[PDB]
Short mmCIF file of N, CA and C and ligand atoms in Angstrom, two decimals:
data_model
loop_
_atom_site.label_atom_id
_atom_site.label_comp_id
_atom_site.label_asym_id
_atom_site.label_seq_id
_atom_site.Cartn_x
_atom_site.Cartn_y
_atom_site.Cartn_z
N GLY A 223 118.18 34.33 90.07
CA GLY A 223 118.21 34.80 91.78
C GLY A 223 118.25 35.88 92.17
N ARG A 224 118.48 36.96 90.89
CA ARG A 224 118.11 38.53 91.39
C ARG A 224 117.20 38.90 90.99
N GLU A 225 115.67 38.04 90.18
CA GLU A 225 114.53 38.55 90.07
C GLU A 225 113.02 37.51 90.50
N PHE A 226 112.16 38.59 90.88
CA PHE A 226 111.24 38.00 92.26
C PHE A 226 110.54 36.58 91.17
N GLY A 227 110.72 36.54 89.93
CA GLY A 227 110.35 35.48 89.69
C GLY A 227 111.13 34.07 90.03
N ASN A 228 112.43 33.88 90.36
CA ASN A 228 112.94 32.86 90.51
C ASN A 228 114.00 33.50 91.92
N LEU A 229 113.50 33.54 92.68
CA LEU A 229 114.24 33.41 93.98
C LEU A 229 114.82 32.05 94.72
N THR A 230 113.69 31.38 95.15
CA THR A 230 113.39 29.81 96.32
C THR A 230 112.18 29.67 95.79
N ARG A 231 112.45 28.07 96.63
CA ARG A 231 111.28 27.06 96.39
C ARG A 231 110.66 26.91 97.57
N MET A 232 109.66 27.46 97.50
CA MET A 232 108.86 27.25 98.91
C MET A 232 107.54 26.60 98.56
N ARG A 233 106.90 25.90 99.36
CA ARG A 233 105.82 25.01 99.27
C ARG A 233 104.42 24.88 100.68
N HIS A 234 103.78 24.84 100.45
CA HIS A 234 102.61 24.21 101.27
C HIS A 234 102.35 25.59 102.53
N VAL A 235 102.80 26.85 101.77
CA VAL A 235 102.36 28.06 102.79
C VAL A 235 101.32 29.27 102.40
N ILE A 236 100.46 29.95 103.19
CA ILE A 236 99.61 30.44 102.95
C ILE A 236 99.49 31.82 103.85
N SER A 237 99.03 32.93 102.69
CA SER A 237 99.15 34.40 103.62
C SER A 237 97.77 34.99 103.55
N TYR A 238 97.55 35.69 104.44
CA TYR A 238 96.06 36.70 104.52
C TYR A 238 96.62 38.06 104.74
N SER A 239 95.98 38.92 104.15
CA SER A 239 96.25 40.60 104.34
C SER A 239 94.99 41.09 104.16
N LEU A 240 95.01 42.52 104.61
CA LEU A 240 93.63 43.26 104.23
C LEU A 240 94.21 44.66 103.61
N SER A 241 93.35 45.24 102.97
CA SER A 241 93.87 46.59 102.52
C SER A 241 94.13 47.46 103.19
N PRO A 242 94.65 48.39 102.66
CA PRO A 242 94.90 49.46 103.84
C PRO A 242 93.62 50.28 104.38
N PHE A 243 92.91 50.38 103.54
CA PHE A 243 91.73 51.22 103.78
C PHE A 243 90.80 50.52 104.29
N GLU A 244 90.83 49.46 104.86
CA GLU A 244 90.06 48.61 105.50
C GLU A 244 90.53 48.34 106.94
N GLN A 245 91.52 48.96 107.62
CA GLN A 245 91.88 48.60 108.89
C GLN A 245 92.83 50.15 109.39
N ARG A 246 92.73 50.43 110.90
CA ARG A 246 93.24 51.42 111.30
C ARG A 246 95.15 51.58 111.34
N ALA A 247 95.32 52.46 111.09
CA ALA A 247 96.89 53.05 111.28
C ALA A 247 97.57 52.81 112.60
N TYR A 248 96.81 53.14 113.40
CA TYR A 248 96.96 52.77 114.90
C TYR A 248 96.17 51.91 115.60
N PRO A 249 96.04 50.69 115.43
CA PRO A 249 95.52 49.71 116.45
C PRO A 249 96.53 49.23 117.00
N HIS A 250 95.28 49.16 118.58
CA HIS A 250 95.70 48.79 119.89
C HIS A 250 97.50 49.36 119.69
N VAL A 251 97.59 50.74 119.88
CA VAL A 251 98.30 51.66 120.37
C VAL A 251 98.53 52.04 121.62
N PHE A 252 97.48 51.39 122.54
CA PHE A 252 97.75 51.95 124.15
C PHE A 252 97.52 51.23 124.80
N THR A 253 96.90 49.85 124.60
CA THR A 253 96.90 48.58 125.19
C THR A 253 97.85 47.33 124.90
N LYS A 254 98.09 47.21 123.57
CA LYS A 254 99.14 46.51 122.80
C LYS A 254 100.45 46.95 122.20
N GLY A 255 100.59 48.13 122.44
CA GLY A 255 101.81 48.98 121.71
C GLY A 255 102.83 49.53 122.62
N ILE A 256 102.63 50.08 123.73
CA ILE A 256 103.41 50.34 124.75
C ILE A 256 104.39 48.93 125.60
N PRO A 257 103.18 48.11 125.83
CA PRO A 257 103.59 47.13 126.63
C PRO A 257 105.08 46.26 125.63
N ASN A 258 104.75 46.19 124.25
CA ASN A 258 105.85 45.86 123.57
C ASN A 258 106.87 46.47 123.38
N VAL A 259 106.59 47.84 123.52
CA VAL A 259 108.09 48.64 123.39
C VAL A 259 108.96 48.40 125.10
N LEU A 260 107.95 48.38 125.96
CA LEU A 260 108.53 47.82 127.38
C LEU A 260 108.99 46.69 127.54
N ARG A 261 108.83 45.61 126.66
CA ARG A 261 109.37 44.45 126.45
C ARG A 261 110.77 44.54 125.83
N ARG A 262 110.96 45.27 124.54
CA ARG A 262 112.16 45.61 124.00
C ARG A 262 112.92 45.68 125.06
N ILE A 263 112.64 47.33 125.45
CA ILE A 263 113.70 47.76 126.33
C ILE A 263 114.33 47.05 127.76
N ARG A 264 113.31 46.73 128.33
CA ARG A 264 113.77 45.89 129.30
C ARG A 264 114.48 44.43 129.19
N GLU A 265 114.40 44.23 127.74
CA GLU A 265 115.34 42.81 127.64
C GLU A 265 116.72 42.99 127.08
N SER A 266 116.97 44.27 126.88
CA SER A 266 118.34 44.76 126.73
C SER A 266 118.63 45.88 127.35
N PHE A 267 118.33 45.48 128.03
CA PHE A 267 118.78 47.27 129.43
C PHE A 267 120.14 46.61 129.89
N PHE A 268 120.24 45.89 130.74
CA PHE A 268 121.75 45.34 131.01
C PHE A 268 122.75 44.91 130.13
N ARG A 269 122.31 44.34 128.68
CA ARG A 269 123.43 44.08 128.06
C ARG A 269 124.14 45.64 127.74
N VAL A 270 123.53 46.70 127.74
CA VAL A 270 124.27 47.84 126.86
C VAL A 270 124.17 49.07 128.41
N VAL A 271 123.39 49.40 129.06
CA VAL A 271 123.27 50.65 129.85
C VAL A 271 125.02 50.29 130.67
N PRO A 272 125.08 49.41 131.70
CA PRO A 272 125.97 49.01 132.76
C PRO A 272 127.59 49.91 132.22
N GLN A 273 127.73 49.52 130.75
CA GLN A 273 129.06 49.63 130.55
C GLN A 273 128.97 51.33 130.34
N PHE A 274 128.10 51.84 129.67
CA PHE A 274 128.16 53.41 129.94
C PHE A 274 127.89 53.75 130.75
N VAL A 275 127.44 53.37 132.08
CA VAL A 275 127.74 53.91 133.44
C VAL A 275 129.04 53.77 134.09
N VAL A 276 129.83 52.71 133.56
CA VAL A 276 131.39 52.76 133.82
C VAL A 276 131.76 54.11 133.18
N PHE A 277 131.42 54.20 132.03
CA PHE A 277 132.11 55.40 131.14
C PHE A 277 131.77 56.79 132.16
N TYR A 278 130.69 56.74 132.46
CA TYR A 278 130.40 58.20 132.72
C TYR A 278 131.35 58.25 134.25
N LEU A 279 131.59 57.28 134.76
CA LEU A 279 132.22 57.47 136.35
C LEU A 279 133.68 57.55 135.83
N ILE A 280 134.00 57.33 134.79
CA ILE A 280 135.65 57.14 134.80
C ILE A 280 135.53 58.76 134.00
N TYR A 281 134.57 59.36 133.67
CA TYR A 281 134.58 60.85 133.04
C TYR A 281 134.52 61.71 134.62
N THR A 282 134.02 61.60 135.24
CA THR A 282 133.42 61.99 136.37
C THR A 282 134.95 62.37 137.35
N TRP A 283 135.80 61.11 137.40
CA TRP A 283 136.40 60.97 138.27
C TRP A 283 137.77 62.09 137.64
N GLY A 284 138.02 61.37 136.27
CA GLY A 284 139.07 62.25 135.77
C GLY A 284 138.97 63.85 136.13
N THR A 285 137.84 64.44 135.43
CA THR A 285 137.75 65.53 135.42
C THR A 285 137.84 66.35 137.15
N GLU A 286 137.27 65.38 138.27
CA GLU A 286 137.61 65.64 139.71
C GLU A 286 139.12 65.35 139.98
N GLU A 287 139.78 64.64 139.29
CA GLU A 287 141.57 64.64 139.70
C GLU A 287 142.11 65.86 138.79
N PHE A 288 141.41 66.17 137.48
CA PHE A 288 142.47 66.96 136.98
C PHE A 288 142.51 68.36 137.71
N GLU A 289 140.98 68.53 138.13
CA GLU A 289 141.10 69.97 139.07
C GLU A 289 141.72 69.40 140.11
N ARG A 290 141.57 68.54 140.87
CA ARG A 290 142.00 68.34 142.54
C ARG A 290 143.86 68.39 141.63
N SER A 291 144.10 68.14 140.93
CA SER A 291 145.67 68.67 140.78
C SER A 291 145.94 69.92 140.71
N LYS A 292 145.54 70.81 140.30
CA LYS A 292 145.52 72.16 140.01
C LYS A 292 145.70 73.09 141.47
N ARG A 293 144.98 72.07 142.52
CA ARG A 293 145.07 73.14 143.92
C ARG A 293 146.30 73.26 144.15
N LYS A 294 146.71 74.00 145.03
CA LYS A 294 147.92 74.64 145.61
C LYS A 294 148.21 73.41 146.69
N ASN A 295 149.63 73.46 146.73
CA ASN A 295 150.18 72.40 147.68
C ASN A 295 150.35 72.80 149.02
N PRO A 296 149.75 72.63 150.14
CA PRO A 296 150.14 73.35 151.19
C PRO A 296 151.45 72.57 152.08
N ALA A 297 152.10 71.49 151.17
CA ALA A 297 153.04 70.97 151.85
C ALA A 297 154.36 71.23 151.26
N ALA A 298 154.14 71.95 150.28
CA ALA A 298 155.12 72.52 149.56
C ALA A 298 155.81 74.28 150.00
N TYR A 299 155.18 74.74 150.94
CA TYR A 299 154.96 75.59 151.35
C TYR A 299 155.14 75.83 152.98
N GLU A 300 155.31 74.78 153.77
CA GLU A 300 154.92 74.91 154.99
C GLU A 300 156.57 74.81 155.75
N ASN A 301 156.95 74.49 154.74
CA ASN A 301 159.00 74.71 155.02
C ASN A 301 159.45 75.54 154.14
N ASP A 302 158.43 76.06 152.96
CA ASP A 302 159.43 77.64 152.49
C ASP A 302 159.77 78.72 153.32
N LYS A 303 158.99 78.74 153.91
CA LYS A 303 159.08 79.80 155.14
C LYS A 303 160.24 80.61 154.43
N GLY B 274 94.48 35.64 65.28
CA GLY B 274 95.63 36.64 64.70
C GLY B 274 96.41 37.00 65.57
N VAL B 275 97.59 36.99 65.40
CA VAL B 275 98.66 37.62 66.51
C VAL B 275 98.10 38.51 67.10
N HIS B 276 97.79 39.53 66.57
CA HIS B 276 97.22 40.84 67.14
C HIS B 276 95.62 41.05 66.14
N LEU B 277 95.07 40.06 65.92
CA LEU B 277 93.77 40.15 65.31
C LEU B 277 93.03 40.04 66.38
N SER B 278 92.50 40.99 67.33
CA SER B 278 91.39 40.24 68.58
C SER B 278 91.54 41.65 69.34
N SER B 279 90.54 41.37 70.47
CA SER B 279 90.21 42.44 71.24
C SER B 279 91.97 42.85 71.82
N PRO B 280 92.10 44.20 72.15
CA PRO B 280 93.15 44.74 72.64
C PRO B 280 94.09 43.89 73.62
N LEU B 281 93.28 43.22 74.82
CA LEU B 281 93.95 42.50 75.66
C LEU B 281 94.04 41.38 75.09
N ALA B 282 93.46 40.47 74.40
CA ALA B 282 93.87 39.25 73.54
C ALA B 282 95.41 39.62 72.39
N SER B 283 95.22 40.67 71.79
CA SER B 283 96.34 41.03 70.62
C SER B 283 97.48 41.18 71.69
N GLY B 284 97.34 41.84 72.96
CA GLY B 284 98.76 41.49 73.99
C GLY B 284 99.04 40.57 74.53
N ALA B 285 97.90 39.62 74.56
CA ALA B 285 97.88 38.18 75.17
C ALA B 285 99.13 37.71 74.12
N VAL B 286 98.99 37.87 73.03
CA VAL B 286 100.31 37.66 72.15
C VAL B 286 100.80 38.33 71.13
N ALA B 287 101.81 39.23 72.31
CA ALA B 287 102.28 40.27 71.30
C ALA B 287 103.81 39.74 72.17
N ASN B 288 104.02 39.59 73.48
CA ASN B 288 105.26 39.10 73.94
C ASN B 288 104.91 37.78 74.40
N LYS B 289 103.74 37.00 74.19
CA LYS B 289 103.63 35.84 74.50
C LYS B 289 103.49 35.80 76.04
N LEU B 290 102.31 36.82 76.75
CA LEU B 290 101.95 36.61 78.00
C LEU B 290 101.27 35.85 78.53
N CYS B 291 100.27 35.71 78.57
CA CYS B 291 98.98 34.57 78.92
C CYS B 291 99.11 33.34 78.07
N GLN B 292 98.62 32.37 78.90
CA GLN B 292 98.37 31.12 78.60
C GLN B 292 96.97 31.26 77.99
N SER B 293 95.76 31.74 78.88
CA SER B 293 94.33 31.83 78.81
C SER B 293 93.94 32.67 79.33
N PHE B 294 92.93 33.38 79.47
CA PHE B 294 92.20 34.43 80.44
C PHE B 294 90.52 34.40 80.01
N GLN B 295 89.95 35.12 81.18
CA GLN B 295 88.37 35.27 80.96
C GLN B 295 88.09 36.52 81.97
N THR B 296 86.47 36.70 81.55
CA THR B 296 86.14 37.90 82.41
C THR B 296 84.79 37.13 82.91
N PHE B 297 84.61 37.74 84.22
CA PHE B 297 83.33 37.17 84.93
C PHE B 297 82.68 38.38 85.48
N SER B 298 81.13 38.43 85.71
CA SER B 298 80.61 39.08 86.63
C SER B 298 79.26 38.27 87.04
N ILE B 299 79.92 37.92 88.84
CA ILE B 299 79.25 36.77 89.23
C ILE B 299 77.97 37.76 90.11
N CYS B 300 76.68 37.67 89.90
CA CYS B 300 75.50 38.62 90.37
C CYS B 300 75.00 37.85 91.72
N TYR B 301 74.72 38.49 92.50
CA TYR B 301 74.21 37.54 93.57
C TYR B 301 73.02 38.67 93.95
N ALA B 302 72.08 38.43 94.83
CA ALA B 302 70.74 38.71 94.82
C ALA B 302 70.89 40.34 95.61
N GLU B 303 71.63 40.71 96.31
CA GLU B 303 72.28 42.11 96.67
C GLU B 303 73.67 42.46 96.41
N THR B 304 74.38 41.63 95.70
CA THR B 304 76.01 41.95 95.55
C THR B 304 76.51 41.49 94.18
N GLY B 305 77.35 41.08 94.17
CA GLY B 305 78.40 40.22 92.87
C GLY B 305 79.46 40.62 92.87
N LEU B 306 80.12 40.13 91.98
CA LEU B 306 81.70 39.92 91.79
C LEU B 306 82.20 40.09 90.60
N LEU B 307 82.76 41.66 89.72
CA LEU B 307 83.07 41.94 88.64
C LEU B 307 84.54 41.21 88.74
N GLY B 308 85.36 41.37 87.67
CA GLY B 308 86.78 41.14 87.59
C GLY B 308 86.93 40.48 86.45
N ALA B 309 87.99 39.57 86.53
CA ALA B 309 88.83 39.00 85.36
C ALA B 309 89.66 37.53 86.24
N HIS B 310 89.78 36.85 85.22
CA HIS B 310 90.41 35.80 85.61
C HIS B 310 91.85 35.20 84.71
N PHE B 311 92.88 34.55 85.05
CA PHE B 311 93.73 34.93 83.88
C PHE B 311 94.62 33.51 84.65
N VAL B 312 95.58 32.67 83.78
CA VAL B 312 96.60 31.75 84.55
C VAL B 312 97.83 32.76 83.40
N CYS B 313 99.16 32.11 84.24
CA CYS B 313 100.35 32.95 84.07
C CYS B 313 101.57 31.99 84.10
N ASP B 314 102.34 31.93 83.33
CA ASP B 314 103.10 31.46 83.40
C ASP B 314 104.41 32.61 84.36
N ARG B 315 105.55 31.49 85.33
CA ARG B 315 106.08 32.23 86.56
C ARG B 315 106.70 33.64 86.08
N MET B 316 106.99 33.64 84.98
CA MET B 316 107.98 34.92 84.79
C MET B 316 107.17 36.21 84.14
N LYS B 317 105.93 35.89 83.82
CA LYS B 317 105.03 37.03 83.17
C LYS B 317 104.03 37.50 83.98
N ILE B 318 103.66 37.07 85.11
CA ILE B 318 102.76 37.51 86.03
C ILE B 318 102.71 39.12 86.19
N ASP B 319 103.76 39.93 86.21
CA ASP B 319 103.25 41.39 86.49
C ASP B 319 103.12 41.65 85.32
N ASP B 320 103.54 41.56 84.27
CA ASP B 320 103.17 42.06 82.65
C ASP B 320 101.74 42.02 82.49
N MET B 321 101.03 40.70 82.46
CA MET B 321 99.46 40.48 82.70
C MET B 321 98.95 41.82 83.60
N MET B 322 99.35 41.50 84.93
CA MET B 322 98.48 42.52 85.84
C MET B 322 98.54 43.85 85.20
N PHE B 323 99.78 44.14 84.67
CA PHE B 323 99.66 45.59 83.93
C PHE B 323 98.87 46.06 83.41
N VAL B 324 99.09 45.03 82.12
CA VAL B 324 98.18 45.06 80.95
C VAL B 324 96.44 45.28 81.07
N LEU B 325 96.44 44.15 82.13
CA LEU B 325 94.88 44.17 82.44
C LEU B 325 94.47 45.13 83.19
N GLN B 326 94.96 45.93 84.20
CA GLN B 326 94.63 47.25 84.89
C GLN B 326 94.87 48.36 83.76
N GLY B 327 95.68 48.61 82.88
CA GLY B 327 95.89 49.34 81.86
C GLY B 327 94.29 49.50 81.26
N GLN B 328 93.68 48.18 80.53
CA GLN B 328 92.17 48.01 79.76
C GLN B 328 91.30 48.82 80.55
N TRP B 329 91.18 48.30 81.95
CA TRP B 329 90.03 48.74 82.36
C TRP B 329 90.54 50.14 82.68
N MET B 330 91.15 50.81 83.22
CA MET B 330 91.73 52.34 83.32
C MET B 330 91.25 53.06 81.93
N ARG B 331 91.51 52.25 80.57
CA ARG B 331 91.34 52.79 79.19
C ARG B 331 89.91 52.96 79.01
N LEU B 332 88.98 51.92 79.84
CA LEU B 332 87.80 51.81 79.60
C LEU B 332 86.50 53.15 80.56
N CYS B 333 87.63 53.01 81.33
CA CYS B 333 87.02 54.17 82.53
C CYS B 333 86.94 55.47 81.82
N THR B 334 87.84 55.50 80.95
CA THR B 334 87.51 56.84 80.18
C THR B 334 87.66 56.51 78.53
N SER B 335 88.21 57.17 77.72
CA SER B 335 88.91 57.05 76.29
C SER B 335 88.13 56.03 75.53
N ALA B 336 86.51 55.96 75.83
CA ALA B 336 85.87 54.66 75.51
C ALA B 336 85.26 55.29 73.94
N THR B 337 85.51 54.44 73.01
CA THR B 337 85.22 54.88 71.63
C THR B 337 83.75 54.00 71.16
N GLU B 338 83.09 54.47 70.54
CA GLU B 338 81.72 54.54 70.18
C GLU B 338 81.55 52.92 69.48
N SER B 339 83.00 52.74 68.72
CA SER B 339 82.76 51.56 67.64
C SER B 339 83.00 50.23 68.49
N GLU B 340 83.85 50.57 69.53
CA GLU B 340 84.41 49.53 70.53
C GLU B 340 83.02 48.62 71.02
N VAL B 341 82.13 49.89 71.53
CA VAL B 341 81.04 49.97 71.80
C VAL B 341 80.16 48.74 71.29
N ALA B 342 79.98 49.50 69.84
CA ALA B 342 79.04 48.79 69.33
C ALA B 342 79.51 47.43 68.99
N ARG B 343 80.65 47.11 68.66
CA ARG B 343 81.14 45.41 68.61
C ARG B 343 80.88 44.51 70.19
N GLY B 344 80.87 45.32 71.39
CA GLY B 344 80.47 44.76 72.42
C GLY B 344 78.97 44.47 72.57
N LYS B 345 78.20 45.28 71.91
CA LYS B 345 76.70 45.16 72.11
C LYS B 345 76.52 44.19 70.55
N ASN B 346 77.16 43.81 69.87
CA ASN B 346 76.67 43.10 68.73
C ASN B 346 77.13 41.42 69.21
N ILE B 347 78.45 41.63 70.33
CA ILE B 347 78.82 40.25 71.02
C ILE B 347 77.78 39.52 71.94
N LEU B 348 77.22 40.95 72.77
CA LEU B 348 76.46 40.25 73.72
C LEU B 348 74.95 39.75 73.06
N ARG B 349 74.30 40.75 72.29
CA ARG B 349 73.25 40.15 71.43
C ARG B 349 73.38 38.59 71.07
N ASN B 350 74.35 38.26 70.70
CA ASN B 350 74.80 37.27 69.76
C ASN B 350 74.63 36.30 70.93
N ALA B 351 75.86 36.16 72.03
CA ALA B 351 75.81 35.58 72.83
C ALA B 351 74.59 35.12 73.71
N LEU B 352 73.72 36.26 73.83
CA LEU B 352 72.44 36.35 74.80
C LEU B 352 71.58 35.01 74.32
N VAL B 353 71.04 35.37 72.99
CA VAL B 353 70.71 34.62 71.85
C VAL B 353 70.73 33.10 71.92
C1 CDL C 530 97.78 62.39 121.67
C2 CDL C 530 98.85 61.83 122.37
C3 CDL C 530 99.51 60.90 121.40
C4 CDL C 530 100.88 60.28 121.83
C5 CDL C 530 101.39 59.11 120.66
C6 CDL C 530 102.47 58.35 121.26
C7 CDL C 530 102.90 56.87 120.64
C8 CDL C 530 103.72 57.46 119.42
C9 CDL C 530 103.62 55.91 118.17
O1 CDL C 530 102.94 55.36 118.15
O2 CDL C 530 104.95 55.85 118.40
C10 CDL C 530 104.65 54.32 117.82
C11 CDL C 530 104.67 53.14 118.68
C12 CDL C 530 104.94 51.79 118.29
O3 CDL C 530 106.20 51.47 117.64
P1 CDL C 530 105.92 50.02 116.69
O4 CDL C 530 105.77 50.09 115.58
O5 CDL C 530 105.42 49.21 117.72
O6 CDL C 530 107.78 49.33 116.72
C13 CDL C 530 108.51 50.14 116.05
C14 CDL C 530 108.59 51.81 116.43
O7 CDL C 530 107.35 52.28 115.59
C15 CDL C 530 110.05 52.49 115.28
O8 CDL C 530 109.91 51.60 113.96
P2 CDL C 530 109.82 52.58 113.06
O9 CDL C 530 110.16 51.79 111.59
O10 CDL C 530 108.07 52.31 112.92
O11 CDL C 530 110.11 53.63 113.02
C16 CDL C 530 111.70 54.51 113.04
C17 CDL C 530 111.47 55.58 112.61
C18 CDL C 530 110.96 57.03 113.81
O12 CDL C 530 109.74 56.48 113.86
C19 CDL C 530 109.34 57.27 114.91
O13 CDL C 530 108.31 57.18 115.51
C20 CDL C 530 109.87 59.10 115.17
C21 CDL C 530 109.11 59.90 115.99
C22 CDL C 530 107.62 59.83 115.48
C23 CDL C 530 106.44 60.18 116.26
C24 CDL C 530 104.88 60.25 115.39
C25 CDL C 530 104.02 59.94 116.57
C26 CDL C 530 102.34 60.00 115.70
C27 CDL C 530 101.25 59.43 116.87
O14 CDL C 530 113.50 56.15 112.26
C28 CDL C 530 113.60 55.57 110.85
O15 CDL C 530 113.06 54.88 110.30
C29 CDL C 530 114.42 56.45 110.50
C30 CDL C 530 115.87 56.92 110.93
C31 CDL C 530 116.69 58.13 110.34
C32 CDL C 530 117.45 58.52 111.99
C33 CDL C 530 118.27 60.04 111.43
C34 CDL C 530 119.21 60.48 112.45
C35 CDL C 530 119.76 61.79 112.39
C36 CDL C 530 120.51 62.19 113.35
O16 CDL C 530 104.20 53.60 120.13
C37 CDL C 530 103.97 52.74 121.13
O17 CDL C 530 103.08 52.41 121.19
C38 CDL C 530 105.31 53.20 122.05
C39 CDL C 530 105.09 54.67 122.13
C40 CDL C 530 105.91 54.89 123.49
C41 CDL C 530 105.09 56.40 124.52
C42 CDL C 530 106.03 56.13 125.90
C43 CDL C 530 105.01 57.16 126.58
C44 CDL C 530 105.34 57.23 128.25
C45 CDL C 530 104.44 57.97 129.12
#
C-alpha cells in the first residue's frame, strides 16, 4: 500500500506523453494560458473579495471614529464661561 | 548458470529479476529501432530498467576487447 508496485487495481486505461525535448516549455501561453487564469479568478471572485472589503470598511470607520473622539468638545466649553 | 552468462543474464538471476528478455535492431530503408525487450514481475520493473540502462552506459565506455571478441564469434556463428 506504500510501494508503487502495489497501490491500487486499475484496468482499461491508456496514457500518452511526449518527451520534454520534443515540446515547448511555454505552449499557447498567450492565447490559451491567460484566458484560463481569467476563468480561475472570475470563478472565485465573489466567494472571497467581498468579505475583505467589509474588513476595509470596518478598518476605515474605526480610525475615523478614533480620531473623531480626540477632537475638542464645543459643548463642554459653551457653558464653562 | 546462476552467474555463468552475459552480465545482464547473470544479473537476471542474482535477485531473480527477469523472466525473459531479448535485444533487437529492427532496420528500415531509412531508419530503424535499436533497443531491448523484457518481461517483468510486478515488483521488479524498476530494477530491470536500472540494470539494462547500466549495461548500455557501460558499453558506451569501458568496452573490453575480450567482450567484443565474444560478440564477434556469436555474430559469425549466428549469421552462418
Ligand atoms: C516578454 C514578456 C513575458 C511576460 C510573461 C507573462 C506570463 C508569465 C507566465 O508564463 O506565468 C505562467 C502562467 C500560466 O500559469 P499556469 O501553469 O497555467 O497555472 C498555474 C500557475 O503557473 C501557478 O502555478 P505553478 O505551479 O506553475 O507555480 C506556482 C509558483 C509561482 O509560479 C510563478 O510563476 C512565480 C512567478 C515567476 C514568473 C516567471 C515568468 C516567466 C515567463 O509558486 C510556488 O510553487 C512556490 C510558492 C512559494 C511561496 C513562498 C511565499 C514566501 C512569502 O502564464 C499565464 O498565462 C498567466 C500570466 C498572467 C499575466 C497577466 C498580464 C496582464 C497584462
